[PDB]
Structures are given as structure tokens and as C-alpha cells.
Subunit: 211 residues, 3 copies
């Protein structure tokens, strides 16, 4: 089809059922929404993510370390359930019965540029500097005023997992949010549970499957 769309997650950002990998062997739940539009083999889309201190492990200092996490968008999860690393709930593609293949990173482009994720499925975070390749987008997130969020980066990488049973690539999205030095520490064990961050829908583009 000429234009196809794909979405997963909760557009109201109220279901904290999405799995994020954090640095140093950690995990957190977030609410997220993803929309992709594919035309002519080129895919443009947005990701939007939110979470609060209550879901987050209590190690490190967010002011010095940044708030870092990653999620995986997995278009072939309909035919390869093991690829659903972020534990999404099941997409809507339009028009119905457009293949999800359209939203996987291009296979020819992915050769030798793809990141192979750690194969333990509760711990697939990869620091920016060990990603094989990526594209970088700059944005500003918002959140509780005391966090003093100043900026953020998104990296978009083509990825695969050894646990996958199919040929189709995934999209790894790594996030880094930064605070002004006077912000409070998000990872502080006595920090209020209700401290939260919320990104805008961050746009990205990549090459998908084509004829």
C-alpha cells in the first residue's frame, strides 16, 4: 500500500506496562506510545514516554548520571512473540493486513550496522557508545519542576536479539534526559514517588522494507 501506519502503546499514557532496560542491570516500567507512518520504504514516526520515581530503582544520582533507559519497538512481534522485549500489547496496522514487515529497519541497510542485544531478556540495555550505529535527535523533556529537566537525546538503532526466531529487525530507542545541577535526584530513595518525566512525541525517520 502507498501509506501504512503502525501504532502500539497507550496514547493516554496511563498504562505503565511497558518494560524499559536501564544501565547496570536494571529495569523500570513506563507508559509509552509509538506511531509510525511508512511511505515509499521510508518510515517516519514518533515515540512518547512517561514514568515516575515510584517505578524506578534507587541507585545512582540522576543529576550526575542522567536518566537513561531504552525501549524496543518490535514490529515483527505478531509472527515472532519472543521479539517483544518491551512487552507491548499488540499493534494496530492500517490498512488491515498490510504486512508488519514494512516497519522493520531495512535488511540490506542493517547488514553490519545492526546491534545484537544481550540475550538475557530482562537486561538488554546497551550504552550509546557500544551501539554499532545510530541516529541522534535532540529534544527537551518536561516533568516535575524540582527535577529541573534541561534536555534529552534519543538514539535510534537497528537491533536484533539472539532469542528471536525471525529475520526481521527491531528498533532500539535509547534515551538520555539531563537535569540542571540544582535538580533533585530522581533515584533518591526518599524522593517523592510522584516525581515524573514526560517527553514530547519525539520524531524519527529510518529506512524500512521496500520492493
Amino acid at each position: 500500500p502507498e501509506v501504512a501506519t503502525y501504532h502500539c502503546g497507550d496514547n493516554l499514557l496511563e498504562s505503565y506496562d511497558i518494560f524499559a532496560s536501564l544501565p547496570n542491570t536494571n529495569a523500570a516500567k513506563v507508559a509509552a506510545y509509538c506511531r509510525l507512518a511508512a511511505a515509499g520504504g521510508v518510515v517516519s514516526g514518533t515515540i512518547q514516554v512517561t514514568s515516575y520515581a515510584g517505578r524506578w530503582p534507587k541507585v545512582g544520582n540522576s543529576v550526575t548520571d542522567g536518566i537513561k533507559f531504552a525501549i524496543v519497538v518490535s514490529p515483527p512481534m505478531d509472527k515472532d512473540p519472543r521479539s517483544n522485549l518491551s512487552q507491548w500489547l499488540g499493534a494496530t496496522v492500517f490498512p488491515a493486513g498490510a504486512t508488519t514487515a514494512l516497519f522493520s529497519p531495512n535488511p540490506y541497510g542493517s547488514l553490519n550496522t545492526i546491534t545484537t542485544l544481550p540475550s538475557i531478556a530482562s537486561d538488554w540495555y546497551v550504552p550509546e557508545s557500544n551501539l554499532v550505529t545510530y541516529t541522534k535527535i535532540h529534544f527537551k523533556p518536561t516533568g516535575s519542576q524540582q527535577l529541573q529537566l534541561a534536555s534529552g537525546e534519543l538514539v535510534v538503532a537497528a537491533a536484533k536479539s539472539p532469542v528471536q526466531t525471525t529475520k526481521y529487525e527491531l528498533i532500539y530507542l535509547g534515551f538520555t534526559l539531563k537535569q540542571n545541577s540544582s535538580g533533585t535526584n530522581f533515584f533518591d530513595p526518599n524522593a517523592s514517588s510522584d516525581l515524573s518525566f514526560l517527553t514530547p512525541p519525539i520524531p524519527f525517520t529510518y529506512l524500512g522494507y521496500y520492493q
Copy 2:
């Protein structure tokens, strides 16, 4: 419709009738052209802007402060004339009678990420660091050789004005142009009137209305 387009402004960049807001309760007129294409609820587009010293406030120093200004793109201005903050003299949509709603930042995405503009129609500039959320693009502008323009940033923020009568969101575009330290001061009262800057068409993407 599958693909819809929107444009406003003068593609020949000869009508200096677009109102730009500046730092410190100043304003300037610019010529501008904006084109958006929406497919699958994702919108990609460009903005191009030009102006000359004659039209610009003689205060501060552009070399140390940068040249800063903002314009608003306002898709719902056909049904809410008060939202036309930059005072575009009309807009065209194709195919005819596609709703302008398609080009407004997505309402679910906009919740809690939107910036509320100062409520006065002639003074709505918001410094980058007070924008609630945004996406950043880096470019290089051109202009009179003696300005020695080195680079620029565009920030794209979803916004709304208290003066609006509808729920449809606007796009706030904040610009910063930077000069090499030996360039002449654009804001100097004795500067030649003809000193000008001109951006290329700067591309941006955001999430719009969908089903």
C-alpha cells in the same frame, strides 16, 4: 485523505508582512514560507524565513546575544482567527476541504507537553529554556557577508494561546542565529538597513491529528 498538504506565506519571500515576536517585548516583520505534508498522522514540513536590519530593533548586540525570534504556524486560523498570531494572510490546503485539523499537533501528545503563550497577541516570545517541551534542529543560515553567520537552531514546540477560542494547537517555531565574533552587530543603529539573513527551508517533523 492519504497525503494532505498545507502552505502559508510567500514562497518568493518578498512580502514582509509576517509578525515575529522578539525578546524584551519587541517585534519584527519577516517574509516566510511554510509547507507541511501529512501522511498517517505524521507531519513533515519546512519553514523558510528572511528579514533585514531596517525592520529590526536597534538594541543589544547580535554577536553576543544571537539573533532570536519566533513565529507561530496556526493551522486552525480558518475557524479561530484569533490564533493567527503571526498574521499570515491566509493558507492553502490540498486536497480542497481536507480539514486543517490534520496539521495541528496531536491532542493526546500535547497534553502536559504544550506551552501556553503569553496572553497578549503582540508579545508572545518564550525563551528556549521556558518552553515546556520541544524538538531541536541545527542548520546554517546565510546572509550579508559582513554578518558572518555561522549557525542556527530551530526549536519546534506545540503551543496554545489563552486568546484562542478553539481547542486546536499551534506550532511555535523559535529561532536562534549565531555569528562569528568578528561579524557586524545586526542591531546597531548605524548598521546598513540592507543587512539581511535568509534561512534555507529547515525541515521538521511532528505528530498531528489522526484516527
Copy 3:
């Protein structure tokens, strides 16, 4: 047509028959693939490039200078063969008989923002700071692990050559890849021929021809 596509180069990246212009009046052969999708006057696409040390001039130091080169995408080469500066073997447009004009940078946007390339036509490299206007994209390339490739920038500029016989603009893509200070020198005369870099498909957007 609503959506048109354009591609040139080898998607398997095995034919090192593409010319890239280099600093100091040098040139190198690369393998490259470019895909563009045009909707509503707005063009999005990717470029992917790879090459190895064997094909590269042995001067300077890549660690301190960076690995810099440029290629030209030339949509009107079907009607203006002289505009084929990077020497693509041909291009494919879909649907067949869609005009290649759609993929040229917009003519109204291009006036006064366009870069005029040097004329002796293997060495039309323009340093970033000499380009009239551009848009900048940040990415991370990959390659031989001893290169220690850390990051890269792509600049997208509208361009023309004095040797062209038509009005249609070209796309100049300038690359800079950077290495960690401990990486080996790609330009070392003793360096293994097989050292290589490979970018991901890097996405970009620009304004093309419209009605």
C-alpha cells in the same frame, strides 16, 4: 503522483564505483545507496556509504583531521548528464515516468541559499564552513574496531555546478566521521588496506519541487 520514490547506487554496497570528493583536491571511490520518497513537495530519504583504506589517499591524519568527504545526489542527471558528479550508474523512479524534478531541492527555496560548486569536476568538495546553507544530522558510524569511530555528521545542502546545462538543483552531502584519540590513522600509508567505515542509512528531509 501522491508518493514517488527515487533510488541510485548499490543496496548491497559492493560496487565501489561512486566518486566522493575529498579535501585538498583529492578523490576516493565508495559504495553508496540512496533512497528518496517524495510526498506533498516534501522529500525524506536516507544515504548509506562505505569504503576502505585501500581506496583512500595517504595524507594527513584521520584522528586529528576526521575522515571528510562529500558526494552529490543528482536527480536531473537523466536530462543533464554533466550533473552526475559522483558518477552513479543510473537511477530508478517509481511510478515509472514520474519526473525526476520532484527530487531536486525546491527552486524558490534555493535562490540565494544554494552553493555553487567548484567547476573542475572531480574536486568539488566544499568545507562545511564554506557551504552557503545546510541542515545538520548527527549519527554514529561503524567500522574496523581499531579505527575507534565515535561519531559523525552529515550536512545536506542545495547545490549547483557551473558545468550543468539545466536549472535543476543537486543535493550535496558532506560527511565528517570522528575517531577516539586512540584509534589508528586511516590515512597511514602502512595501514591495512582492509580498514573500513560503514554508516547506517542516515535520514534527511528537504523541500523539493511542488505545484
